[PDB]
Design an enzyme around this catalytic site. Structure first.
Site, PDB file in Angstrom:
ATOM      1  N   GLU A   1      10.749 -27.959  -0.035  1.00 51.09           N
ATOM      2  CA  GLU A   1      10.965 -27.600   1.357  1.00 51.09           C
ATOM      3  C   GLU A   1      11.836 -26.371   1.623  1.00 51.09           C
ATOM      4  OE1 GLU A   1       9.416 -28.895   3.632  1.00 51.09           O
ATOM      5  OE2 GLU A   1       8.699 -30.852   2.914  1.00 51.09           O
TER       6      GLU A   1
ATOM      7  N   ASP B   1       7.090 -24.120  10.515  1.00 54.82           N
ATOM      8  CA  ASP B   1       6.574 -24.527   9.238  1.00 54.82           C
ATOM      9  C   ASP B   1       5.270 -23.822   8.883  1.00 54.82           C
ATOM     10  OD1 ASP B   1       4.748 -26.186  10.325  1.00 54.82           O
ATOM     11  OD2 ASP B   1       5.824 -28.093   9.870  1.00 54.82           O
TER      12      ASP B   1
END
Ligand SMILES: [Cl-]
Ligand SMILES: [Cl-]
EC number: 3.2.1.17
Length: 162
Positions: A11, A20
């Site tokens: 991540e 994202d």
């Protein structure tokens, strides 16, 4: 290696609001804030989550707090999930981490839909499950990460991450 280190690798860390891979407002270590297109909605979401006037920025400590919360939420979600719990109980430690990773990323609900892959993991049919998992949007959108998680499932080692 451990789950935290594992996810930290998949991540990243960002102290400032960001979008994202799917274009959603996120922060810290994979912490999705909102699916909404508004930065304000995101900004609002963020403050509510930290408990302070953030302004789209957080401290590292704040990022880690959120991360701890999220991983915990994930373990608990799996254990609470009628479809996920058995798969989980059926697995070894490394592979358990791999299921947690997917859940962190896609939600209990999204993972629960890998009906076929799941049955296969449960039966310990490693190579088969790996191929099945690969036939997914998930794989196609985030191939490298997907591959890392998938190898973890196929092998039961942390090799993908070393
Ligand atoms: Cl496909
Ligand atoms: Cl990727």
């Amino acid at each position: 290696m451990n789950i935290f280190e594992m996810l930290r690798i998949d991540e990243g860390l960002r102290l400032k609001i960001y979008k994202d891979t799917e274009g959603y407002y996120t922060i810290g270590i994979g912490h999705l804030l909102t699916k909404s297109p508004s930065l304000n909605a995101a900004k609002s979401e963020l403050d509510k989550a930290i408990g302070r006037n953030c302004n789209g920025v957080i401290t590292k400590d704040e990022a880690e707090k959120l991360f701890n919360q999220d991983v915990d939420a994930a373990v608990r979600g799996i254990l609470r999930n009628a479809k996920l719990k058995p798969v989980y109980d059926s697995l070894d430690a490394v592979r358990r981490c791999a299921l947690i990773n997917m859940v962190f990323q896609m939600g209990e609900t999204g993972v629960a839909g890998f009906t076929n892959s799941l049955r296969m993991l449960q039966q310990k049919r490693w190579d088969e499950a790996a191929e099945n998992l690969a036939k997914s949007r998930w794989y196609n959108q985030t191939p490298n990460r997907a591959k890392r998680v998938i190898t973890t499932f196929r092998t039961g080692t942390w090799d993908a991450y070393k």
